[PDB]
Each structure stands twice: as structure tokens, then as C-alpha cells.
Design a protein around this nucleic acid. Structure first.
Ligand SMILES: CN(C)[C@@H]1C(O)=C(C(N)=O)C(=O)[C@@]2(O)C(O)=C3C(=O)c4c(O)cccc4[C@@](C)(O)[C@H]3C[C@@H]12
Ligand SMILES: CN(C)[C@@H]1C(O)=C(C(N)=O)C(=O)[C@@]2(O)C(O)=C3C(=O)c4c(O)cccc4[C@@](C)(O)[C@H]3C[C@@H]12
Lengths: 276, 276
DNA sequence: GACCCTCCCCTTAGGGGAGGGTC
DNA sequence: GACCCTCCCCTTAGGGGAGGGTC
């Protein structure tokens, strides 16, 4: 009333740190009513304690301090407007997050699916849910000469609307009685999508399409160049012997087993191909 | 394939800034496969481009970099677990925000209500929705000697569970034919609550209770010491003349008109009191 | 030219000290 | 002792330069 509080008093009363109060002092956001010229001690009137209500609340919603300053000079109506503005900012974040939460949930679904492949090396046949992807003409690209840099555009679009890139890399090709990997060329390289956000200015050389819900002859193994071709052969054989008919191209996905640059690279490969 | 990308190439391919790549280099998160000893130029193999998928995605969800490091060495299963952990962190933020969004919406409702008081200075009678508050014994505290520091404990609890403090300050007293502000003493001082989060270790000297839904004789004005008492008198008179019966104490709320420390302080005052 | 280098300063909002003089 | 002072270093993840030597 007829005295000042010293900074410690104010700090206990307002549950704000001393270091905080000295800061707010520095930045002319909250300044002691009076400062002893000899001890440079800070002293605060009781009535001025009220300006902390606003600072503490804005701080809680996380308004930057320089913002708070321009906040103080607001009329009750403009303060209303300002709050409305926060409501907007928030709702934006809530959307971002509901989205994020789902994307992750799905990434997890896919990862699990891969940690459950019944047999590596063996040809299992199974029923698969639809997979949406974005693909693009593979212009004379075999397994032998394809690079990560080849995925640069696809990646750019997908991550530009999914925000998530860590993923698996895809390729399709014609099912033939290949006798040599030398004979192989990809029709498309592709990359799966995780969101429904619309890619923004998608150019015509990208096709958005999917891997149809259907029944697939699959095979999946950890990568090694010996095994790559010979496993493909396992598959062609599986179909040969069971006289199955194919209704799609061979799909091929390579997903990394880890991303530590300290261990030798290792990749899970999965070839599947739809049948009637 | 049989060459390196220079940092600019990698930057365009992976849509990551050069300054970013030099940083990741510094912190041994991503390092060029090779560094020219003479030009200190950075050079990156195509195959190592894959470690950016993970970094870019973690960055999107906003994992700190030192975290990403310990992320890299994870097995596909532990990476799963890690993601689950993010799902937790997020859901936490989504809650925080749905909460925040509501609190604000309500603050706005109250503010509006105050920018619509039909007449300042005049005694309007009206129907009011319930107001939840937290109050505490006012120990020999009149209008004449009450301080902001008096609200220190209430404030602490309410903000400890509401996160929002900027507010209005309350007091109640007995409705009497007062002849002098000298004669006035508050029964309680109080402060409204905005959340339903439970105050955590609430001590018994606080009572959580509310201002009942009911019909109230109100009066509200911008503060000035001349007017304070004389307006209270206006109210006592209103009731006298209409022979109304009172079923509650006088409630009194002071909310600030602005929080700029640059203008002369100004407060909206509102006295209301319930009737049959 | 175009491209890359290191090195330096700047960005929030204070928290943690050290070392001094205080109520 | 308890309390307060200034002053200094440290915390993310780089962006923006300046000034040098490059492909
Ligand atoms: C585009 N694609 C399907 C694969 C890819 O982009 C990869 C990647 N980004 O991780 C593989 O590492 C991928 O680049 C990769 O590792 C491949 C190979 O190195 C080989 C080699 O050396 C010999 C035979 C077959 C392959 C291969 C078909 O598995 C190659 C697949 C490549
Ligand atoms: C607790 N309460 C209801 C009010 C309060 O805490 C205030 C605040 N924190 O802003 C008022 O400024 C409050 O502290 C305040 O301003 C009050 C006063 O200064 C006076 C004076 O000087 C003379 C008569 C009446 C009042 C008064 C009743 O309006 C006082 C109300 C005070």
C-alpha cells in the first residue's frame, strides 16, 4: 500500500522468477515503479502488480514478449480481436497435429506389417488392402543403374504435402521369364503416400494412382545381390508351378532396416505381384 | 553412382539448405562421405542420401537433433516404440490445446458480456447464468485497505490449474443500509475459475463455490473514488424503492480496462446482488 | 560466373553461476 | 544470514553476411 515490494516479494506473490522480472525490466515490459539509485535495487508498487495478469496469461498461450508489449496498449475491444487471432493460430495447430497423429499411426501400421512377414525368402500368397502411391515414368532405369537421386521429384512432392518422407522406394516392371537381371527395366519408379492433403502444383509427369486391393504372390527378404535375382526367380517359378494368371506388374519395394550410418547398410526387399 | 554430389547438389535433391547440411556435418548427424582435404569441400555418395529420409521426417515432427542421433541406432522394432512415444507426446499437446482453445473462447464470452452492459451508472436488473469461483475468508478487509497481494493464494491456485490469470477480482459483503464506506467490510474476496481441471492440493481455507444462476440487480461503471460509494447507494435505493427482497450478498468485480502501464489505470466495476 | 569454403554476429527467454555489496 | 545487485556463459537450429579461394 504505502510501500514497495522488493523483487523477491513480487516473485513469491506473482509466482514469477526473479531472473524473469529483471528480464522484463530490461525489455521495458514490466519495470519496477521505483529503482534505488544507490543499490540499483528494484521496488514495485502493489497496484502495478496487475500488469502481470496479462503477461502471465499471454506467456501461457505462448505469445512472444515483443508481441505482449504491443498487446498492452490495446483497448478491451481490440484485445478481444487479438484473442480471436490466437483462436485462429491454435485451431491451425490442432489441425496440424490431428494430421500428424494420423500420419504416424499409419507409418506404424506399415512398419508392423513388415515385422510380421511370415517367412523371409519363401513365397507367401496373400490378401492386401489398397496402397495409394505416386509414380513416374522410369526412363530406361533398371535395378542396375537406379539412384536415390532418381526419386528426387516424387520425394519432393510427397513430402511437400505429407511432411513425412522417410519411406520405402518402389519400382514396377513387366512379369517375364527373365533369365538375367541384365534383361530388366522398370516401367515406373514410385513412392507411397500417407496423407490426403492435396499435392499443390502437381505436374503432369507424375501420376497419382495406387496398388489395387487384391490377391498377391509375395516374397520378401533382406537384401544381398546374390539373392535379388534368384528370389525373383523363386517367384516366377511359384507362378509357373501353380499355373496362376497375373493381372498386374511386379511391384518392388525397398525399405531400410535402420538409418544408422554407423552400421553396414541393410534393406528389406519385397516383390509382390497380383493374381486372379 | 561412381561420383559424389557436392553440397549444393545434395541440397537441391533433398530440399535441405546448405547451411543445414554444414550444421548436420558439425554435429556428426550427417557427414559427407568424403571431404576434400585441400578445399575442405564436402562430397556425398548417392547411397548415403537415404539417411536424410529419417532426419527430415523427425525434423517435421520436431524431434531435437541430439535426439535424432540416438534415433539412428534404433532397430526397426525400437523405432516403432519410439514413434509410439511421439504419439503420446502429441496426444498430450492436442489435449493442452483443446483446453486452451476453450478457455480462450470463454474469456472472450466474458469480455463481450462486459462490452454490452446497457448502461453505465444506471441500475439494470437481469437474468444471469451461473458463475463458478474460488473464494476465501476476507480477514478484516474493506475496500479501503485491500491489496492485489491479498489475492496471491487464490491467484496461485486458479492459475495453477487454469493457466490463465488475467482476470477480474472479486469481493462480497452484507447488504446493509451503509452510510459510509468506513462501515464496509468484505466477507470474502474471490476470483472466477475458467477450467474444470482440478486444482491439485487445494487447502481447506479455499472454498470452491459459485455465484448462483439467478436474477440480479446490477450496476456497473468505470471506477472513480467519488462514484464508488455513491453508486452502491444508487443500488440500495433501487431495492428500497421497488421493495425487492435480497437473497444473497453484494458481489463486486473489478476488471481492468487495459493493462498498458503507460496510460492512467482504469477499472470497470460491477456490483450485483441476487433477488427473489 | 557459379560454387563452395570458414568465421562471425544474431534470433527467445531466461537459468545458473561468480563475485560483489545489501537489509 | 538472507537478499539483492551486475556481468558472463550456455541452451536450438540454423540464416545472413563478409571475405576469401574454387570449378
Ligand atoms: C530403386 N530401387 C528399387 C532401389 C533403391 O533406390 C535403393 C535405395 N534407394 O535404397 C536400393 O538401395 C537400390 O539402389 C539398390 O541397392 C540396388 C542395388 O544396389 C542392386 C545391385 O547392386 C545388384 C542387383 C540389384 C540391385 C537392386 C535392384 O536391389 C537395386 C535396388 C535399388
Ligand atoms: C479488492 N478489490 C475489490 C479491488 C482491487 O483489488 C483492485 C484491483 N486489484 O485492481 C482495485 O484497484 C482496488 O484495489 C481499488 O482500486 C480500490 C480503491 O483504490 C478504492 C478507494 O481508493 C476508495 C474507495 C473504494 C475503493 C475500492 C473498493 O474500489 C478498492 C477496490 C480494490
Amino acid at each position: 500500500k504505502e510501500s514497495y515490494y522488493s523483487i523477491g516479494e513480487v516473485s513469491k506473490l506473482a509466482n514469477v522468477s526473479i531472473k524473469a522480472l529483471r528480464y522484463y525490466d530490461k525489455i521495458d515490459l514490466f519495470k519496477p515503479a521505483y529503482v534505488d539509485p544507490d543499490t540499483s535495487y528494484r521496488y514495485y508498487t502493489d497496484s502495478q502488480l496487475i500488469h502481470l495478469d496479462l503477461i502471465k496469461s499471454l506467456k501461457y498461450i505462448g505469445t512472444p514478449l515483443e508481441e505482449m508489449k504491443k498487446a498492452q496498449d490495446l483497448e478491451m475491444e481490440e484485445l478481444f480481436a487479438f484473442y480471436t487471432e490466437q483462436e485462429r493460430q491454435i485451431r491451425e495447430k490442432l489441425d496440424f497435429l490431428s494430421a500428424l497423429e494420423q500420419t504416424i499411426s499409419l507409418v506404424k501400421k506399415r512398419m508392423k506389417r513388415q515385422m510380421e512377414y511370415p517367412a523371409l525368402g519363401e513365397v507367401f500368397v496373400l490378401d492386401e488392402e489398397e496402397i495409394r502411391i505416386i509414380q513416374t515414368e522410369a526412363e530406361g532405369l533398371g535395378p542396375e543403374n537406379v539412384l536415390n537421386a532418381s526419386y528426387s521429384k516424387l520425394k519432393k512432392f510427397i513430402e511437400s504435402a505429407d511432411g513425412f518422407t522417410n519411406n520405402s522406394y518402389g519400382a514396377t516392371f513387366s512379369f517375364q521369364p527373365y533369365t538375367s537381371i541384365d534383361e530388366m527395366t522398370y516401367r515406373h519408379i514410385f513412392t507411397p503416400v500417407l496423407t490426403n492433403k492435396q499435392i499443390s502444383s502437381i505436374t503432369p509427369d507424375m501420376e497419382i494412382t495406387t496398388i489395387p486391393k487384391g490377391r498377391y504372390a509375395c516374397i520378401a527378404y533382406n537384401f544381398s545381390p546374390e539373392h535379388y535375382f534368384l528370389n525373383l526367380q523363386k517367384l516366377i517359378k511359384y507362378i509357373a508351378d501353380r499355373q496362376l494368371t497375373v493381372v498386374s506388374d511386379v511391384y518392388e519395394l525397398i525399405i531400410p532396416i535402420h538409418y544408422s550410418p554407423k552400421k553396414q547398410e541393410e534393406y528389406r526387399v519385397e516383390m509382390k505381384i497380383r493374381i486372379l
